[PDB]
Scaffold this active site. Structure first.
Site, short mmCIF file in Angstrom:
data_model
loop_
_atom_site.label_atom_id
_atom_site.label_comp_id
_atom_site.label_asym_id
_atom_site.label_seq_id
_atom_site.Cartn_x
_atom_site.Cartn_y
_atom_site.Cartn_z
N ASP A 19 0.83 -1.20 0.00
CA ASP A 19 0.00 0.00 0.00
C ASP A 19 0.87 1.25 0.00
O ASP A 19 1.92 1.30 0.64
CB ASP A 19 -0.93 0.00 1.21
N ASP A 61 -9.17 -5.20 4.22
CA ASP A 61 -8.08 -5.92 3.60
C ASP A 61 -7.90 -7.32 4.15
O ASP A 61 -7.03 -8.06 3.68
CB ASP A 61 -6.77 -5.14 3.76
N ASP A 119 -3.96 -2.65 5.98
CA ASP A 119 -4.15 -1.79 7.13
C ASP A 119 -5.55 -1.92 7.71
O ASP A 119 -5.71 -2.22 8.90
CB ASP A 119 -3.86 -0.33 6.75
#
Lengths: 14, 846
Positions: free
Chosen positions: B306, B566, B562
């Site tokens: 990410d 996810d 995070d």
């Protein structure tokens, strides 16, 4: 307020 | 279990009460790691538990009953060797975890019933508030609750290096860490065996038995080794059936073969290597939920990370500001800061960025104190501009406006016509920052009754973390490709790719496909998602699709996550990574939970995992090759010549082979660049080739020694002694071979491993010289000649290992798969051109 103290605490990484 | 949030919601000024502290002491417990003292018991625990151990001690009892002191000594020596190696392995693991759990700072300062008091760190309990000052050390896991000045902590400082990181309101502060600067209050979440450090220690302790995918691969390796052992047993028993021999002789030969054919140390040693590796990863701010992740992170081929958390600091910072001619950057920055509220309340991230970047403009810092603010209109969403009327030290009223570029330009234009060249340049620059993703802030000033004057624009965006471009290049050196996933537009993320040097080849997640739509063919979409340098406007649903397609290509995928959304992708990822600050659901659904934010920590833990995997793999290959060498050599010896080494010499060879285990954990670990995937066909081909080479060398020594005049014997010597010395030298030097990432001379072995191997060689040399447990004395000259021949065998092993491990042809032959697909040399260029075309179109979609 105390702007300058806030300035240094915001850039406290030296 | 994580403490409920209700316990964490405590008043920072009054704190918890003593009675509730006692009740939570009854509930959770002190901040103290459990201590156990069973050094005497474990020694015999190794003796008893384990089916080989019971059957072999029963064999020892039977041999003692038959008054055959020889085989009784053999079995007692094997049992003592096994107990010793297991005990030293577990002692090394215990010392490592005790170093991991070492916490001697204590000195906790808390507030009970509104009164500050200093107590030892053990008395603290989860759900409590602790005062944090400069230089203090964190006793237990917790979260920073109060924010007055941002805090800097050394959570990465478990090894010598510090690598301090910043913590604010909401950040998760970590035990065994030292505060470098700042102060505040901290709400503790876990205090013992529940903090991730203590959780990793407890995981190591529980996994001292062994469980995971590596346990399954160990079972497979042991099954195959037992298969080879049965094969050589069949060979020796057949050959000793053809020659009518006493059953005592045949049983002694089968005992000699089974001493060395089966390595009883592989399960314990691999399990201890995983335990110590999990400890080392915990030193590197990475706690593996399962030990298998240590191998899973070792062989990962693609890393989808990410952008917001890892590749960027997540702080909206300031970039080089464009200024109009005649206006200095210092004046522009002073004007921008003067248009900000003096009161701390109300300042958004843009204002914080401005007064943070004020460092580079000392003139603005010196001048701001001389302006007295008369009136202040805050950020109005309609006008999109903050206004501040201030009084200059000369008595001049100055109006400061900071806001949207177009709106500020219009405001300046509404009072006076700006020259067309300045307006065109300013608009071009604003569009240029828009293409680069910087959020732009125009700034203008008014001096008394004079006209409006605009000074420039403010580019603000979250910068790449300091150690990211270095980290990205190093990851590229590590053979794994990094793909950035971001929630921003393609144009915004292209500048991020350029800053990181990833390759500025990204796509809109929705438009490219990944959601059941898009007219791109499935194979073309798969190739795109495989070869892309990142994906913009990504969503939790698209991450799972990316992982699915990448894994369908056989690529080991490491996904960082995070939020809770996810969690599925992390489960689908081959090694789900939970970056710092991740939601507890994401941490639970992750395979390895990380502690230090940034891709540098992830790559460092990947390097550590590769080191651990290569250590385990080197030991496995070395021991399997020793087993193969001894099996082939002894089986052929008793098949052809009806003889073998003395049984006690065989025990000493096995002891020497297992001694290198005591130092394999202490050696300097060289990590292979390319991913390591537990290549069992390649591992077995490598081990078989090495064993065949060692058997060839031993058989050459046998054939030379058979000839009259000595062959290798100069004046006098012993058959068994010289063969034992040669086998020990050519066997215990193989650990120097397998431990190296590439050729054996690339990485110098540590002093511990080299010292252990040299001590073993010295002891074997003394055995040969003085003829202990051998027929005759062996003089020094033939001993040094055997040393030279063993050095030659070591060198040819180096050549074979270098030319076979690093050659993909041998890997293809062992696995049996063909030469991949060999895509046409020109169609790859057309495919890259199509990649670039679609990336440009995805940028142009906007």
């Amino acid at each position: 307020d105390d702007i300058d103290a806030l300035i240094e605490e915001l850039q406290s990484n030296h």
